[PDB]
């Protein structure tokens, strides 16, 4: 994420790495919405246009991640996706609509001080925070600056950032893409005079808010797209983890826990 601060030990035990096994690399961030279930950004895994397309087989999932580099020995978790699940109405062709996906950790992940779920919004929670200027914080390992590459490449540790939902009207006019009442835009604006943005490979990463009600941590989004990274004039775009809360639901009780 552009213009951020580096996270802390435990500040996000739900962050999960989207680690293709080979090219032994990284392509996303996902979150722990269970003991054994994971969700993410659509495109993270199904993208024809760039012959993007995967399978449980291809990739491997990691947890307990402070450093993006090393092999966090006795803190990190690593499981294999038992099955993936895309949103049968996904749009790789249109505007990354329902940009959402989930992955039944093939086996069950036991929690600890670095791995602890996020909770799915309830229309109230979904209703109390989801709104103008009400900051929300994005996490991640992505690209420190607009598309390029220890240096302005990528961080050693997990970058944390916080941002203000934007005005739907304005959301819809920093772009030219048909945007859906399923997607929301985060990010400080121009004069607002501050910076912060999620960037390359930040995707499928969370937009969890703090519910002042039960002070519980709740994931309002799934990082989807944007036009660059921190450019005076537009904001990223995220997924209403809720509109689609229907689904997330529907398929977890059809194939898992």
């Amino acid at each position: 994420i552009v213009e951020g601060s580096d996270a802390e030990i435990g500040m996000s035990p739900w962050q999960v790495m989207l680690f293709r096994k080979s090219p032994q690399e990284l392509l996303c961030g996902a979150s722990l919405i269970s003991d054994r279930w994971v969700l993410t950004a659509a495109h993270c895994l199904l993208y024809p246009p760039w012959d993007k397309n995967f399978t449980e087989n291809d990739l491997l999932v990691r947890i307990g991640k402070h450093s993006r580099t090393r092999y966090e020995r006795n803190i990190e978790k690593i499981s294999m996706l038992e099955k993936i699940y895309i949103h049968p109405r996904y749009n790789w062709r249109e505007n990354l609509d329902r940009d959402i996906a989930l992955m039944k950790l093939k086996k069950p992940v036991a929690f600890s001080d670095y791995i602890h779920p996020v909770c799915l919004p309830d229309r109230e929670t979904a209703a109390s925070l989801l709104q103008a200027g009400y900051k929300g914080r994005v996490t991640g390992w992505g690209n420190l600056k607009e598309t390029w590459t220890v240096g302005k490449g990528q961080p050693s540790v997990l970058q944390v950032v916080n941002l203000p939902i934007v005005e739907r009207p304005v959301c819809k006019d920093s772009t030219r893409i048909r945007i859906t009442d399923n997607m929301f835009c985060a990010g400080y604006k121009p004069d607002e005079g501050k910076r912060g943005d999620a960037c390359e490979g930040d995707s499928g990463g969370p937009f969890v808010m703090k519910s002042p009600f039960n002070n519980r941590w709740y994931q309002m989004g799934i990082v989807s797209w944007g036009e660059g990274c921190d450019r005076d004039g537009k904001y990223g775009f995220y997924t209403h983890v809720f509109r689609l809360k229907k689904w997330i639901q529907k398929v977890i009780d059809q194939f898992g826990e």
Binding site: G10, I33, H116, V118, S211, P212
Partner: peptide
């Protein structure tokens, strides 16, 4: 038990940027 950072909330602790998060809501002045 979810939403409950077992090294912060789970024990009288707050991460150096969340307070920032709070203020947005009651529009911190």
């Amino acid at each position: 038990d979810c939403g409950l950072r077992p090294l912060f909330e789970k024990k009288s602790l707050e991460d150096k940027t969340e307070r920032e998060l709070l203020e947005s809501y009651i529009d911190g002045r």
